[PDB]
Amino acid sequence: KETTSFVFTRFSPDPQNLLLQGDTVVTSSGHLQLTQVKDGEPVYSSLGRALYYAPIHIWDSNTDTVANFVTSFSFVIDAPNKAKAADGLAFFLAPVDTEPQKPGGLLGLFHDDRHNKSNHIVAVEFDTFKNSWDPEGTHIGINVNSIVSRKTISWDLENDEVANVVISYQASTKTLTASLVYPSSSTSYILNDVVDLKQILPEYVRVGFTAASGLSKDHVETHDVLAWTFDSDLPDPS
Amino acid sequence: KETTSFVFTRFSPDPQNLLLQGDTVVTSSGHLQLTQVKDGEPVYSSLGRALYYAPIHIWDSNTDTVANFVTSFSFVIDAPNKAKAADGLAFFLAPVDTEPQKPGGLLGLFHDDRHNKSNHIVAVEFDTFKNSWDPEGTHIGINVNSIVSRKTISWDLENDEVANVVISYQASTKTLTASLVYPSSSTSYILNDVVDLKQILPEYVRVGFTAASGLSKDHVETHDVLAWTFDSDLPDPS
Amino acid sequence: KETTSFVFTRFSPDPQNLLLQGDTVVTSSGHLQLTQVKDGEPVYSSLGRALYYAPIHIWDSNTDTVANFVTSFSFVIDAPNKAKAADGLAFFLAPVDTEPQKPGGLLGLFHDDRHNKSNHIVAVEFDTFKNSWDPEGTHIGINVNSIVSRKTISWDLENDEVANVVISYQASTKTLTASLVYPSSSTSYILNDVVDLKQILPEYVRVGFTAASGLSKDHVETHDVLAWTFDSDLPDPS
Amino acid sequence: KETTSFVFTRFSPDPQNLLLQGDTVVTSSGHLQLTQVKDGEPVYSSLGRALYYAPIHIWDSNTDTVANFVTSFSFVIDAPNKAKAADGLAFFLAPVDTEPQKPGGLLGLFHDDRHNKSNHIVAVEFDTFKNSWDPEGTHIGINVNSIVSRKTISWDLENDEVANVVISYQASTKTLTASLVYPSSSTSYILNDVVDLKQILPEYVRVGFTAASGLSKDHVETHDVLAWTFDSDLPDPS
Ligand SMILES: *[C@@H]1O[C@H](CO)[C@@H](O[C@@H]2O[C@H](CO)[C@@H](O[C@@H]3O[C@H](CO[C@H]4O[C@H](CO)[C@@H](O)[C@H](O)[C@@H]4O)[C@@H](O)[C@H](O[C@H]4O[C@H](CO)[C@@H](O)[C@H](O)[C@@H]4O)[C@@H]3O[C@@H]3OC[C@@H](O)[C@H](O)[C@H]3O)[C@H](O)[C@H]2NC(C)=O)[C@H](O[C@@H]2O[C@@H](C)[C@@H](O)[C@@H](O)[C@@H]2O)[C@H]1NC(C)=O
Ligand SMILES: *[C@@H]1O[C@H](CO)[C@@H](O[C@@H]2O[C@H](CO)[C@@H](O[C@@H]3O[C@H](CO[C@H]4O[C@H](CO)[C@@H](O)[C@H](O)[C@@H]4O)[C@@H](O)[C@H](O)[C@@H]3O)[C@H](O)[C@H]2NC(C)=O)[C@H](O[C@@H]2O[C@@H](C)[C@@H](O)[C@@H](O)[C@@H]2O)[C@H]1NC(C)=O
Ligand SMILES: CC(=O)N[C@H]1[C@H](Oc2ccc([N+](=O)[O-])cc2)O[C@H](CO)[C@@H](O[C@@H]2O[C@H](CO)[C@H](O)[C@H](O)[C@H]2NC(C)=O)[C@@H]1O
Ligand SMILES: CC(=O)N[C@H]1[C@H](Oc2ccc([N+](=O)[O-])cc2)O[C@H](CO)[C@@H](O[C@@H]2O[C@H](CO)[C@H](O)[C@H](O)[C@H]2NC(C)=O)[C@@H]1O
Ligand SMILES: CC(=O)N[C@H]1[C@H](Oc2ccc([N+](=O)[O-])cc2)O[C@H](CO)[C@@H](O[C@@H]2O[C@H](CO)[C@H](O)[C@H](O)[C@H]2NC(C)=O)[C@@H]1O
Ligand SMILES: CC(=O)N[C@H]1[C@H](Oc2ccc([N+](=O)[O-])cc2)O[C@H](CO)[C@@H](O[C@@H]2O[C@H](CO)[C@H](O)[C@H](O)[C@H]2NC(C)=O)[C@@H]1O
Ligand SMILES: *[C@@H]1O[C@H](CO)[C@@H](O)[C@H](O[C@@H]2O[C@@H](C)[C@@H](O)[C@@H](O)[C@@H]2O)[C@H]1NC(C)=O
Ligand SMILES: *[C@@H]1O[C@H](CO)[C@@H](O)[C@H](O[C@@H]2O[C@@H](C)[C@@H](O)[C@@H](O)[C@@H]2O)[C@H]1NC(C)=O
Ligand SMILES: [Ca+2]
Ligand SMILES: [Ca+2]
Ligand SMILES: [Ca+2]
Ligand SMILES: [Ca+2]
Ligand SMILES: [Mn+2]
Ligand SMILES: [Mn+2]
Ligand SMILES: [Mn+2]
Ligand SMILES: [Mn+2]
C-alpha cells in the first residue's frame, strides 16, 4: 500500500516542493498566480502551470492495482470584461516530465486541438472561452488526451468570486467526479464520467494546475489558486 | 482544537458504537438495513435510524468557534415499483438525546409537517414520495427544523443502484453542500445552501441516518447504507 | 475496515463526548482534572476517570481481525511533597460498562490486588506510590487484569512538569508499547510487552484515564490531562 | 499552513518518488535494500541511500515558523557474524541537493569525522561498529553536523529481527525523539535531545535513509527498510 498527501492553505514565496512553469509566481498574499498581472491588470497571451514536485504513484502494473485520489482547491478568475473572458484553468495529471504546451485555448496542455493517446493527459477544465471545438457557453469539462472534452456541463463564471472545487477518482468504478461550489451565491455544479486511468496515464504522474489568458489584448482574465489539498491511495492487491 | 473521525467500509453485526433506533439491523452482508425486509421484500410502515454513539462537538459558545465537517456514504434504495417508491432516507444532525419521531413522509425526523425551531434538526433528505408539502418529483432536499425543505433539486432514483453521497459544511461561509453520484450511469447531482449551524443546533449533536418505508402496503422500498465516513474539526479561536 | 479517531488539544467545560466518573472535572484552563483540588491544593482520597463516549471496536470475532491503535496524551502530576506522592494515573481499556473500582493504590481500576481474567482490563500506569505489590521506586507499568504489573520500568516523577506519552498496539506482533518524554529536561522512558488483546478484552471497549490521590492527608498530588489523541484501525480480513 | 505525508507499507520496483543513491535497490520481496547483497550474502564496502523525492518544508523564515514531524519505519540488519557487524543505518535530514559522502563508519553522511556546520545534517544513527569516535558497544545516536553523536544510548542489535522506529520532532520544545522497539524480544530503546532545526537546516530539506557495510570483507551486514511513513506539519504563524 502506498499513499501520498499534501495540504497548502496558502502558498509561500519560492515553494521548492512545487514545479512552477511558464509565468507562474506566488503573490505576497500567498496565492498561486498562474497568469501574469501587470499594474493590477491581467496580461494577454500568458500561460503558467504549477505541479507538485513528487511523482504520484497512480497505478502499478505488477500488482494490477489503481489508486483512488481526491483533490480539493479554491480558485478565483477575475475578468475585466466577463463577455471577453479567456481562456481558463485546469487541474491535470500528466507524465512526470510534462512541460507547458500551446497557450490560449489549448490551456498549456496540448500541442494541437486533436486527440492523441501519447499525450497521456487527464484534466478537468474550467473553460471561459468558446473555441471552435467547444460547446456553447462557459463550461466545466473532463478531458482525456484532447482539448475536445469527453463530457461537459454548463458553468456560469462568477467573476472574481472564490470557487471551491473537489475532484475525486474512484478506481473500483473508474469514475472521475468534479464539483464546483460558489459559497457566495450558493451555486453548485457537478459532473462525472468513466475514465480508465490505467489505460490513459503512466504508472507515475505529476499533478497540478495550468491556466492561460486570451491571445488578444481585450480577452484577458486572472487565474489564482488560493489553497490546495491532495490525497492518493494505491491499495494492496486483492 | 477538537476533531472526531470514523470510517466504516462495511458494518459488523451488533455495532456497539452505533445507536440503532426503530427497525434498524445489520445484515450478514455487512449493510446497515434501516427499514425491514421480510422474505426478500421490503415491509411497509417501517422506520429505522442509526446514530454514531459519541456526541460530536459542532460549535463552542465560549470560544465562538464552529466546526467544519464532511461525511461520505454509499446507499441503495430498491423499490419493487419505482412509481410507488416511499418514503426515503436522510442524513441528519440532531440533539444528543434525539429519538425517532413520526414514520412515513416525516422520515422519523419530525413530529409534524410544520416548522419549529425547537426541533434543532439539520438534514439532507433523499425523498422518494411526493407528500402534500413536497415539490413535484423525487428530490434531494436540505431541511432545517422542518420536513418542508429549505432548498430542493430534482433527483431521479436509480432503482437498486449504489449512490455515493458527500455532505460537507464550511463554517466560514455557513455553507452546507450535498452531492450524489451514481457511478453505474455517470449521473450526478449537487446542491448547497446557507445553513447557520450555530443558530440551529446545540453545541453537541449526534449524527446519522434515518429512513422510512411507505405507510401503505404497495408503497415500499428498502434503504441500505453500505459504508460511511465522518470527519469534524472544531478549530481553535482566531 | 473500521477506524475511530479523536483529538483534544484542550478540553471544554461539560464535555458531552466524555464519560466523566468519580471526581473528574474540566478546569477553566481546559485541563481534565482527574482528582479533586480545593483552594489550590490536592485533596486526599480522591478518584476520577474519563472515558471517550463511543465504544472502540478493538477486535472482531466474525472476521477474526484485531485492531491496531495509537494514543498520545500530555499529563501533569503536581505533588506538594514529592517523597509523599500518591497514587498515580493510568491510561486504560475496559468493558463498555466499566465503572470506578477501589481508590488509592488500586487506581480506580481494580476491586482488589489479585489477578482475575474477568476484569478485562489492560492499562498503562504511572505509579507514584510503592504499594506492597509494587517494585522499588516510582515506575511505569503495563497491567493486564491486575494491579500487579506484568512489566515495569523505573520512572522519576518530574514534579509539575508536562509529560508527553505515546501508547501504541501492533496487532501483528501483539505488542503494546508505552513511551514518556519530559521535553523540559530531555528525559525519556519506554517499555513494551506482549499483550494479546483478543484474549483479554471484549470486542468493544471504552478507553480513557483514571487517577487517584493517596489515602492519607499528607500523601497527595494532582493528576491533570492537558491533551489527548486516539486512533484505532480494525483492518479487513486477510 | 502546509503539510506533507506519505506511506509505504512496502516498496515497488523502480520507485520514481524516491531518489535512490549509491547501491540501493528494491527487492522482489518489496524491501528497500540499501547495501548490496550477492548470492544471499552482504557485500563489503557498500553504501546506499534513499530519499523522498519531494523537498520537505521544515521551516519558513517569512512567517518564522518551524514544522513538527513524525516518521516511522521498520528495518532489518542481518550480520553473518554479529560481533563483526558493520557499519549501520541512519535516518536523516539534509539539503535538497545532498549526495552520498564517505562509506564505512561515516555512513554515507559525512566527508570526514569532524564537526562542520556546513554539513547541515541532522541524523539518527543505528551504529553497529565502534569507530575511534564512538562509545563502547553498539548504540543509537542523535547526530548534528558530525558523525560524533551529540547523545548516544546502548542498543543491542537483534540480528535479523524487525526493528520498529519512530522519530519525531516537536517544534515548540525543539525536541527530537527517537525510539526503537523489537516486538520479537519485547526490548525497547529511546532517547531525545534539543535540536534547533531552524539553526541547523535550510528551509527545505530531503529526508530518508543511508546505510553502509564494513570496509573489510569479514565485517558485513545487510540493511533493509521494510516500510516507512512520514508526516510533517508547518503551522500558521502564532
Ligand atoms: C473473578 O471475578 C469474576 C467476575 O466477578 C468471578 O466470577 C463471577 O462469580 C460470581 C459469584 O461470586 C457469579 O455470580 C453468581 O452467578 C450465579 C449463576 O448466575 C447465572 O446463571 C443462573 C442460571 O443457571 C441465572 O439464574 C443467573 O441469573 C445468572 O445468569 C448466580 O446463581 C449467583 O446468584 C445467587 O447467589 C448469590 C450468592 O449466594 C446471591 O447473592 C444472589 O442473590 C443469588 O442468590 C451469583 O450471582 C450474583 O449474585 C450477586 C450479584 O451482586 C451479582 O451481580 C450476581 O451475578 C458470576 O456469575 C461470575 N461471573 C462470571 C463471568 O463467571 C470470579 O469468581 C470465580 O469464578 C466464577 C465464575 C465463579 O466460579 C466463582 O465461584 C469463582 O469464585 C472471580 N474469580 C476468582 C478466581 O475469584
Ligand atoms: C566544511 O565543509 C566544507 C564543504 O565541503 C569544506 O570545504 C571544502 O573543503 C574541501 C577539502 O576537502 C575542498 O576540496 C578540495 O579542494 C582542492 C582545491 O580545488 C580547486 O583548486 C584546484 C587548484 O588550486 C583545482 O585543480 C580544482 O579544480 C579546484 O578549482 C582540490 O584540489 C582537492 O582535491 C579537494 O577537492 C573544497 O574546495 C572546499 N569547499 C569550500 C566551499 O570551501 C570545509 O573545509 C574546507 O577545505 C578545508 C581543506 C579547509 O581549507 C577549510 O578552511 C575549508 O573550509 C569544511 N570545514 C572544515 C573546517 O573542515
Ligand atoms: C488580434 C486577434 O484577433 N488575434 C487572433 C489570432 O490572429 C492573430 C492576428 C494577428 C496577430 N498579430 O501578430 O498581431 C496575432 C494573431 O488568431 C487566434 C486564433 O488562431 C486568436 O486566438 C484566440 O484568441 C481568443 C481570444 O481572442 C482565445 O484566446 C482563443 O482561445 C484563441 N484561440 C486559440 C485556438 O488559441 C487571436 O485572438
Ligand atoms: C390505505 C391508506 O389509506 N393508507 C394511508 C393511511 O391511512 C390511515 C388509515 C387509518 C389510520 N388510523 O389512525 O387507524 C391511519 C392512517 O394514512 C397515511 C397518512 O396519514 C397514508 O400515509 C401516506 O402513505 C404514503 C404511501 O401510500 C406515503 O408513505 C406518505 O408519506 C404517507 N403520508 C404521511 C403523512 O406519512 C397512508 O397511505
Ligand atoms: C493514616 C493511615 O496510615 N491510613 C492508612 C489506612 O488506614 C487503615 C488503618 C488500619 C486498617 N485496618 O485494617 O484496621 C485499615 C485502614 O490504610 C490504608 C490501606 O492500607 C492506607 O492506604 C495507603 O495510603 C497510601 C498513602 O499514605 C497510598 O495511597 C496507598 O496506595 C494506600 N494503600 C492502598 C491499598 O490503597 C492508609 O495510608
Ligand atoms: C583488514 C583491515 O585492517 N582493514 C581496514 C583497512 O585497512 C587498510 C590498511 C592499509 C590500507 N592502505 O591504504 O594500504 C588501506 C586499508 O582500513 C580501513 C579504514 O581505516 C578499515 O575500515 C574500517 O573497517 C571496519 C570494519 O572492518 C568498519 O567498516 C569501519 O567503519 C571502517 N573505518 C572507517 C573509518 O570507515 C578497514 O577495516
Ligand atoms: C502525440 O503526442 C506526442 C507528445 O505528447 C508527440 O510527441 C507525438 O508526435 C509524434 O511523435 C513524436 C515523438 C514525433 O516523432 C512526431 O514527429 C510525431 O508526430 C504526437 N503524435 C502525433 C501524430 O501528433
Ligand atoms: C416545537 O417543538 C418542541 C420540541 O419538539 C415541542 O415540544 C413544541 O410543542 C409544544 O411544547 C411542547 C413541550 C408540548 O408542551 C406541546 O404540547 C406544545 O405544543 C413545539 N411547538 C409548537 C408546535 O408550537
Ligand atoms: Ca475554450
Ligand atoms: Ca416526501
Ligand atoms: Ca502503587
Ligand atoms: Ca560506527
Ligand atoms: Mn472546452
Ligand atoms: Mn421532501
Ligand atoms: Mn505499580
Ligand atoms: Mn556512532
Backbone angles phi, psi at C171, to 5 degrees: -60, -40
Q: How far apart are the first and last CA of chain C?
A: 11
Residue B43 CA to ligand 8 center (angstroms) comes to 31
Q: Do chains B and A touch (3 or more CB pairs under 8 A)?
A: yes
- Residue of minimum CA distance from atom 3 in ligand 7: A118
CA A105 to chain centre: 14
Residue A218 CA to ligand 3 center (angstroms) comes to 11
**Structural contact between residues B68 and B195, judged by C-beta atoms closer than 8 angstroms:** no
Chain D contact for C45 (CB, 8 A cutoff) = no
Q: How many CB atoms lie within 10 A of CB B205?
A: 27
Helix (H, G, I), strand (E, B) or coil at C106: helix
The dihedral built from the CA positions of residue C112, C116, C122 and C126, taken in this order, carries a sign that is: positive
Q: Does B186 sit within 8 Å of A192, measured CB to CB?
A: yes
- Residue of minimum CA distance from atom 3 in ligand 6: D216
Tell me the chain C residues in contact with residue B15 when contact means C-beta distances shorter than 8 Å. 57
Among A65, A99, A57, smallest CA distance to A203 is for A57
Q: Does A188 sit within 8 Å of B177, measured CB to CB?
A: yes
Nearest to C204 among B3, B16, B204 (CB): B16
Query: CA A124, A127, A132 angle in degrees (round to 5)?
Result: 115
Q: What is the largest CA-CA distance in chain A?
A: 57
**Structural contact between residues A109 and A143, judged by C-beta atoms closer than 8 angstroms:** yes
Residue C21 C-alpha, separation from nearest chain D C-alpha, in angstroms: 32
Among C80, C57, C88, smallest CA distance to C165 is for C88
- The C-alpha torsion from B180 through B182 and B183 to B188, rounded to 10°, is -50
Chain C contact for B192 (CB, 8 A cutoff) = no
Q: Which ligand sits nearest to residue D44's alpha carbon?
A: 6
The conformation of residue D214, written as its DSSP 8-state character, comes to -
Q: Does D16 sit within 8 Å of A9, measured CB to CB?
A: no
**Structural contact between residues D77 and D159, judged by C-beta atoms closer than 8 angstroms:** yes
Chain C contact for B182 (CB, 8 A cutoff) = no
Q: Does D17 sit within 8 Å of A56, measured CB to CB?
A: yes
CA atoms of B15 and B52, how far apart (whole Å)? 10
CA atoms of B25 and B20, how far apart (whole Å)? 7
A181: exposed, middle or buried (Cβ count in 10 Å: 0-12, 13-18, 19+): buried
Residues for chain D: how many in total?
238
Q: Which three cell numbers stand for residue C88?
A: 498515580
Ramachandran class of D22: left when φ > 0, alpha when ψ lies in -120 to 50, beta otherwise = left
- Residue of minimum CA distance from atom 12 in ligand 7: A118
User: Which chains pack against C, by 3+ Cβ pairs within 8 A?
Assistant: B, D
Q: Which three cell numbers stand for residue B68?
A: 467544519
Tell me the chain A residues in contact with residue D5 when contact means C-beta distances shorter than 8 Å. 3-6
Q: Does D189 sit within 8 Å of C175, measured CB to CB?
A: no
Which helix (DSSP H) or strand (DSSP E) does residue C49 occupy?
Answer: strand C47-52
Q: Which three cell numbers stand for residue C73?
A: 496524551
Chain A contact for B72 (CB, 8 A cutoff) = no
Q: Which three cell numbers stand for residue D2?
A: 502546509
**Per-position b or e across C146-171, b if 16+ CB within 10 A of its CB:** bbbbbbbbebebbeeebbbbbbbbbb
Choosing from B116, B144, B145 the residue with most ligand 8 atoms within 8 A of its CB, the one to mutate for a pocket test is B116
| Atom of ligand 2 at shortest range from CA of D117 | 1
In one-letter notation, the amino acid at residue C153 is I
User: Which chains pack against A, by 3+ Cβ pairs within 8 A?
Assistant: B, D
Give residues 161 to 180 of C whose Cβ lies within 8 Å of D.
Answer: 164, 166, 170, 173-175, 177, 179
Alpha helix (H) residue ranges in D127-179: none
In one-letter notation, the amino acid at residue D29 is S
Among D8, D34, D7, smallest CA distance to D20 is for D34
**Structural contact between residues C217 and C41, judged by C-beta atoms closer than 8 angstroms:** no
Backbone angles phi, psi at C133, to 5 degrees: -85, -5
Q: Which three cell numbers stand for residue A197?
A: 486511468
| Atom of ligand 4 at shortest range from CA of B103 | 36
Helix (H, G, I), strand (E, B) or coil at C98: coil
CA atoms of C233 and C214, how far apart (whole Å)? 37
Residue B116 CA to ligand 8 center (angstroms) comes to 8
Q: Do chains B and D touch (3 or more CB pairs under 8 A)?
A: no
Among B143, B135, B147, B121, smallest CA distance to B51 is for B121
Nearest to D6 among A4, A8, A204 (CB): A4
Look up cell 522519530; give the residue: D167
Strands (E), chain D: 2-8, 18-22, 25-26, 32-33, 37-38, 41-42, 47-52, 56-57, 59-60, 65-66, 68-78, 87-95, 122-127, 139-144, 151-154, 163-170, 175-182, 187-194, 204-213, 222-234
In one-letter notation, the amino acid at residue B144 is V
Helices and strands: H and E segment counts in chain C: 1, 20
| Atom of ligand 4 at shortest range from CA of B132 | 35
Nearest to B1 among C7, C17, C52 (CB): C7
CA atoms of B232 and B170, how far apart (whole Å)? 11
Q: How many CB atoms lie within 10 A of CB C86?
A: 22
Q: Does C191 sit within 8 Å of D183, measured CB to CB?
A: no
Question: Three-state SS across B162-188?
Answer: CEEEEEEEEHHHCEEEEEEEECCCCEE
DSSP string covering A40-97 = TEEPTT-EEEEEESSPEE-EETTTTEE-EEEEEEEEEEE-SSGGG--EEEEEEEEETT
For chain C, domain boundaries: 1-238
Tell me the chain D residues in contact with residue C177 when contact means C-beta distances shorter than 8 Å. 179, 181, 188
CA atoms of D68 and D40, how far apart (whole Å)? 40
Spell out which residues have Cβ within 5 A of ligand 15, the ion: C 127, 134, 141
**Structural contact between residues B147 and B102, judged by C-beta atoms closer than 8 angstroms:** no
Which helix (DSSP H) or strand (DSSP E) does residue C187 occupy?
Answer: strand C187-194
Chain C contact for D96 (CB, 8 A cutoff) = no
Residue A61 CA to ligand 12 center (angstroms) comes to 41
Q: Which residue of B has its CA nearest to C206?
A: B17
CA A54 to chain centre: 17
Q: How far apart are the first and last CA of chain D?
A: 11
Chain D contact for C184 (CB, 8 A cutoff) = yes
Q: What is the CATH number of domain A1-238?
A: 2.60.120.200
Q: Which three cell numbers stand for residue A22?
A: 511558464
**Structural contact between residues B110 and B103, judged by C-beta atoms closer than 8 angstroms:** no
Tell me the chain A residues in contact with residue B183 when contact means C-beta distances shorter than 8 Å. 170, 173, 175, 192
**Structural contact between residues C198 and C59, judged by C-beta atoms closer than 8 angstroms:** yes
Q: How many CB atoms lie within 10 A of CB A218?
A: 10
**Structural contact between residues A229 and A71, judged by C-beta atoms closer than 8 angstroms:** yes
DSSP string covering chain B = -EEEEEEESS--SS-TTEEEEET-EE-TTS-EE-S-EETTEEPTT-EEEEEESS-EE-EETTTTEE-EEEEEEEEEEE-SSGGG--EEEEEEEEETT------GGGTTT-SSSS--GGG--EEEEEE-S--TTSPSSSEEEEEESSSS-SEEEE----TT--EEEEEEEEGGGTEEEEEEEETTTTEEEEEEEE--HHHHS-SEEEEEEEEEE-SSTTS--EEEEEEEEEEEEEPPP-
Nearest to B1 among C9, C15, C53 (CB): C9
CA atoms of C197 and C171, how far apart (whole Å)? 8
CB-based contacts of D102: which residues, under 8 Å, 6+ apart?
D108, D110, D111, D112
Q: Which three cell numbers stand for residue C237?
A: 480480513
Tell me the chain A residues in contact with residue B188 when contact means C-beta distances shorter than 8 Å. 177, 179, 190-192
The dihedral built from the CA positions of residue C149, C153, C156 and C161, taken in this order, carries a sign that is: negative
CA atoms of B100 and B120, how far apart (whole Å)? 14
Tell me the chain C residues in contact with residue D10 when contact means C-beta distances shorter than 8 Å. none
DSSP string covering chain A = -EEEEEEESS--SS-TTEEEEET-EE-TTS-EE-S-EETTEEPTT-EEEEEESSPEE-EETTTTEE-EEEEEEEEEEE-SSGGG--EEEEEEEEETT------GGGTTT-SSSS--GGG--EEEEEE-S--TTSPSSSEEEEEESSSS-SEEEE----TT--EEEEEEEEGGGTEEEEEEEETTTTEEEEEEEE--HHHHS-SEEEEEEEEEE-SSTTS--EEEEEEEEEEEEEPPP-
CA atoms of A178 and A167, how far apart (whole Å)? 4
Q: Which three cell numbers stand for residue B188?
A: 450526478
DSSP string covering C126-186 = EE-S--TTSPSSSEEEEEESSSS-SEEEE----TT--EEEEEEEEGGGTEEEEEEEETTTT
Among C131, C196, C95, C209, smallest CA distance to C163 is for C209
| Atom of ligand 2 at shortest range from CA of D112 | 60
**Structural contact between residues C231 and C167, judged by C-beta atoms closer than 8 angstroms:** no
Among D49, D64, D43, smallest CA distance to D19 is for D49
Instruction: Tell me the C-alpha to C-alpha distance, in Å, between residue D159 and each of B60, D23, D182.
Output: 53, 22, 11
Q: Does D188 sit within 8 Å of C192, measured CB to CB?
A: yes
DSSP string covering D75-122 = EEEE-SSGGG--EEEEEEEEETT------GGGTTT-SSSS--GGG--E
Nearest to B96 among C16, C57, C236 (CB): C16
The conformation of residue D238, written as its DSSP 8-state character, comes to -
Instruction: Tell me the C-alpha to C-alpha distance, in Å, between residue D210 and each of B204, D40, D90.
Output: 49, 21, 5
Q: How many CB atoms lie within 10 A of CB B81?
A: 11
Which helix (DSSP H) or strand (DSSP E) does residue C199 occupy?
Answer: helix C197-200
Q: How many CB atoms lie within 10 A of CB A19?
A: 17
Chain C contact for D9 (CB, 8 A cutoff) = no
Q: Which residue of B has its CA nearest to A172?
A: B183
Q: Does C52 sit within 8 Å of B236, measured CB to CB?
A: no
CA atoms of D195 and A109, how far apart (whole Å)? 45
CA atoms of B148 and B134, how far apart (whole Å)? 7
Residue D55 C-alpha, separation from nearest chain A C-alpha, in angstroms: 5
**Structural contact between residues A19 and A51, judged by C-beta atoms closer than 8 angstroms:** yes
Radius of gyration in angstroms for the set of CA atoms belonging to chain D, rounded to a whole number: 17
